[PDB]
Amino acid sequence: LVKQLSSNFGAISSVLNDILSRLDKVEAEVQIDRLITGRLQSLQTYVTQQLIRAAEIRASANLAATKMSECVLGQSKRVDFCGKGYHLMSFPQSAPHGVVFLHVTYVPAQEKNFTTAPAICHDGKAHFPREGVFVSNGTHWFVTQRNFYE
Amino acid sequence: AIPTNFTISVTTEILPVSMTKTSVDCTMYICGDSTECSNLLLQYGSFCTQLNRALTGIAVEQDKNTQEVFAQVKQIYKTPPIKDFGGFNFSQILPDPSKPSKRSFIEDLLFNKVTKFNGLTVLPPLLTDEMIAQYTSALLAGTITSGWTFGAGAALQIPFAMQMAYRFNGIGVTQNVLYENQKLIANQFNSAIGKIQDSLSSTASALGKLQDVVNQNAQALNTLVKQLSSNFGAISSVLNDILSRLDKVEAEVQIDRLITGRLQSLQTYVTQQLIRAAEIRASANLAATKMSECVLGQSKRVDFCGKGYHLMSFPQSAPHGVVFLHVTYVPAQEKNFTTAPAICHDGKAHFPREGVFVSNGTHWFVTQRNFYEPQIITTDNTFVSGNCDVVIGIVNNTVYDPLQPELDS
Amino acid sequence: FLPFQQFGRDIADTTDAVRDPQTLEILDITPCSFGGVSVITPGTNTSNQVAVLYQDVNCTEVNVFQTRAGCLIGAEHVNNSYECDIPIGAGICASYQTSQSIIAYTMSLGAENSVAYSNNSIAIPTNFTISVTTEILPVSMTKTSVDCTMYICGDSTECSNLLLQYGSFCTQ
Amino acid sequence: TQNVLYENQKLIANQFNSAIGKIQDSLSSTASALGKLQDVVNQNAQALNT
Ligand SMILES: *[C@@H]1O[C@H](CO)[C@@H](O[C@@H]2O[C@H](CO)[C@@H](O)[C@H](O)[C@H]2NC(C)=O)[C@H](O)[C@H]1NC(C)=O
Ligand SMILES: *[C@@H]1O[C@H](CO)[C@@H](O[C@@H]2O[C@H](CO)[C@@H](O)[C@H](O)[C@H]2NC(C)=O)[C@H](O)[C@H]1NC(C)=O
Ligand SMILES: *[C@@H]1O[C@H](CO)[C@@H](O[C@@H]2O[C@H](CO)[C@@H](O)[C@H](O)[C@H]2NC(C)=O)[C@H](O)[C@H]1NC(C)=O
Ligand SMILES: *[C@@H]1O[C@H](CO)[C@@H](O[C@@H]2O[C@H](CO)[C@@H](O)[C@H](O)[C@H]2NC(C)=O)[C@H](O)[C@H]1NC(C)=O
Ligand SMILES: *[C@@H]1O[C@H](CO)[C@@H](O[C@@H]2O[C@H](CO)[C@@H](O)[C@H](O)[C@H]2NC(C)=O)[C@H](O)[C@H]1NC(C)=O
Ligand SMILES: *[C@@H]1O[C@H](CO)[C@@H](O[C@@H]2O[C@H](CO)[C@@H](O)[C@H](O)[C@H]2NC(C)=O)[C@H](O)[C@H]1NC(C)=O
Ligand SMILES: *[C@@H]1O[C@H](CO)[C@@H](O)[C@H](O)[C@H]1NC(C)=O
Ligand SMILES: *[C@@H]1O[C@H](CO)[C@@H](O)[C@H](O)[C@H]1NC(C)=O
Ligand SMILES: *[C@@H]1O[C@H](CO)[C@@H](O)[C@H](O)[C@H]1NC(C)=O
Ligand SMILES: *[C@@H]1O[C@H](CO)[C@@H](O)[C@H](O)[C@H]1NC(C)=O
Ligand SMILES: *[C@@H]1O[C@H](CO)[C@@H](O)[C@H](O)[C@H]1NC(C)=O
Ligand SMILES: *[C@@H]1O[C@H](CO)[C@@H](O)[C@H](O)[C@H]1NC(C)=O
């Protein structure tokens, strides 16, 4: 925007005082009008870009507020909304013109291949887990939590 | 009213993700191959480079949108050669190895529905249709073979029927309903997919949300080009026709008239593109949100990923967009049952641990809220708190104690 | 062309074709090949070597690698894929690697992996790790304010009086 | 647990009814409550006047 003050826009000079100090009114008003049109257009361009950028910032701020409410104040069931992993808790940190969230997540680290089954027959009855899944270590059947071998 | 039967439905949600990456050269558009016009244009400073910058920013954000929507998986997963998925047929959404581009049948259907000299160019996307198809293949193979585990961390293999059992538990329906009705569920799923294929193969308007984006950008460019035909007060719209007949002094004035008009035309175009780009970005952010919370996980958000109780979703690529196939559980048939909030027994007030109390007119049962499956009311189904003189609408019945006959013998 | 037609025009009113005034044949006028020129470069704190992309042209009209993004000159084509560094377009990215030089390659989409799926095998985690990630979001931007009179006219009454003929353009 | 509601159902209904009455009293007395919508009306009207 400041650089635009250096443009002539068709005028004999970009410096308004240099136009006024050398030419009398009648034609000088024309030369000034050329600069007014160009500089006014420059401001309109600047303001339009700022309004669009401001809309972008507002969307980001709304997202940040949403995360603050549903991650720091609560616990998020939304996948990858507050970082990768199963969300536990988050911590806000301030930053210049922004906010930084530290997302604490639970990530499975080591796994084993187990044989499974959807149900077990006993006396003709079909037994299903109340919680967890059925696993076999190759000789014995166990019931264990879905997200942690126990 | 408690549902006694259910139907598995598949819905299609179509979202724009990107728009054509145009770039406009102000000198060739405004002046072309004319130095006199270019020299006049230089008196307007940076008006051009701010337009090249704005369009570059848009072009970059079109690739950012695609990457955030599709590039959510660190690895490219692939299905096994044996499709033992419990009766669920995925052959119409998985890559077809026989095509020159490994797209699914449905993706091929989607691509068949959506259809320079003045300084106006179109940049290629960074991610080709091949790269997008591979990404949707990886996301689909992960979803099918590992459920939601590939989203949080490592892809942990699980039988598909058990994965669906978890998805059913996630909506308040005990996993045993799925296994007892597994064949029915697989047949309903396969039929729903066939219906999706028939719709896409017959309803052209299905992809209107993406076609309109294509139309809006194309028309805008046509409008910009049409503006070269305007005089803007000059004796002629053709710059060379002005330069070849008039000498410098007045010709510079006639050229200035065209520069002002054409520069205004570009500014209008760029402003409209920035606003439209913001719209596309919001849509892409929504698509990425759905991808993360529907395909990689399971959504508890009502109507976020289609109507019904969400089970799973499948991404499909489309021209300048993404198509989600949302698999939902919808109650199908219901009966009128009499209910009660609690039952008095020995003065104790019994409440269900899970489910509600129902009566068929002669006997009281406890059943799941979302699926009629009557069980005998027992001490292992209900809990005691307080007594019958507080709860409004409490009824008299008996609660069977499974331990009593065990102690008598 | 019909016997009375001498010139053809495009949507922009530029000449599309002309009929030669001496020999009555039609010549199409296609403006000669042009395009944007982009420079692919590592930062100047690392190297002053660059590659040049001539957009949407063949390398004949201008070692040399023809891509659908254009003719890339100065970057060596490498068969090995990598993570995208400096994007070019159409699946091609470039980077500065090992002497050292600029390379061009088809970008990798991630490691290839298969899931050991079967109808009776489940993988259940036995251990876990607690990870912390950082998410950075903009919230605000500098609260600028611009005075149209000082910007446009400054300390000049004659200009201000002319500006008043434009009404509310400023106060908006 | 759902038993809390049933044991306290009368209290809950009375609190709900009172809260609604408070909403009515606020809307009947606080003009600024709908400012978010009035500003939209004002922004478009002024723009046309401009
Ligand atoms: C599967 O788990 C069971 C239970 O832990 C194992 O059975 C035990 O094996 C140990 C020897 O490692 C014996 O000392 C115990 O008496 C066994 N208990 C029972 C109840 O049998 C079984 O060996 C494991 N199998 C495999 C292949 O790991
Ligand atoms: C639940 O609804 C399904 C259909 O949505 C029923 O399945 C149909 O059953 C009839 C038997 O009268 C068959 O002729 C149809 O071919 C079946 N359709 C499918 C898709 O399998 C099912 O029987 C219903 N169950 C109950 C208990 O009402
Ligand atoms: C999954 O559904 C597709 C639907 O097309 C099945 O493909 C058809 O299979 C039948 C016989 O198996 C052929 O006669 C058709 O020509 C096939 N159609 C197409 C388009 O390929 C596929 O076989 C089904 N898979 C399973 C395992 O049942
Ligand atoms: C309500 O359900 C109960 C339990 O299913 C029904 O009682 C059974 O009725 C059948 C006849 O249809 C008898 O053969 C069983 O011996 C009954 N069992 C018991 C424990 O009483 C009862 O008839 C049903 N009532 C209605 C109106 O449907
Ligand atoms: C539910 O059962 C209780 C007791 O089994 C009933 O309470 C009796 O009500 C009658 C009539 O009001 C009294 O005369 C008895 O003295 C009460 N007995 C007890 C132990 O409180 C109660 O009325 C029954 N509810 C319904 C709806 O029939
Ligand atoms: C689970 O993983 C943790 C590391 O993430 C293991 O803790 C390490 O155990 C080794 C023992 O071999 C120590 O030398 C390391 O210092 C431990 N690291 C930390 C951070 O405490 C843990 O033992 C693993 N548990 C199982 C059952 O595999
Ligand atoms: C499970 O078995 C397959 C069979 O080849 C193997 O490739 C895979 O690595 C095994 N899983 C683990 C966690 O070792
Ligand atoms: C429940 O009873 C009402 C009583 O008229 C009836 O209109 C309604 O259709 C019944 N519900 C079902 C599912 O039949
Ligand atoms: C339900 O309504 C009937 C209407 O006559 C009434 O007699 C009965 O007591 C009511 N029950 C409850 C729990 O409100
Ligand atoms: C970039 O230059 C600065 C200053 O010379 C240097 O400190 C920094 O490490 C350089 N960056 C890289 C990636 O080498
Ligand atoms: C010109 O570009 C086309 C692009 O497809 C290429 O096939 C051709 O070989 C290039 N060179 C020519 C025409 O000499
Ligand atoms: C790269 O792969 C192509 C495949 O056609 C091959 O012709 C070429 O020689 C390879 N380059 C090197 C350096 O191996």
Swiss-Prot record, chain A:
It comes from the Viruses. Changing residue 140 to Y: In strain: Theta/P.3. Residues 1-32 form a coiled coil. Changing residue 21 to A: In strain: Alpha/B.1.1.7. Disulfide bonds join 71-82. Glycans are attached at residues 113, 137. Subunit of the fusion protein that is processed upon entry into the host cell. Mediates fusion of the virion and cellular membranes by functioning as a class I viral fusion protein. Contains a viral fusion peptide that is unmasked after S2 cleavage. This cleavage can occur at the cell membrane by host TMPRSS2 or during endocytosis by host CSTL. In either case, this triggers an extensive and irreversible conformational change that leads to fusion of the viral envelope with the cellular cytoplasmic membrane, releasing viral genomic RNA into the host cell cytoplasm. This is Spike protein S2'. The gene is S. The chain holds residues 962 to 1111 of 1273 of the full protein.
UniProtKB/Swiss-Prot annotation, chain B:
Changing residue 150 to L: In strain: Eta/B.1.525. Glycans are attached at residues 5, 89, 336, 360, 396. Changing residue 333 to H: In strain: Kappa/B.1.617.1. The record marks 103-104 as: Cleavage. Residues 211-255 form a coiled coil. Residues 182-232 are annotated as: Heptad repeat 1. This is Spike protein S2. The gene is S. The chain holds residues 713 to 1147 of 1273 of the full protein.
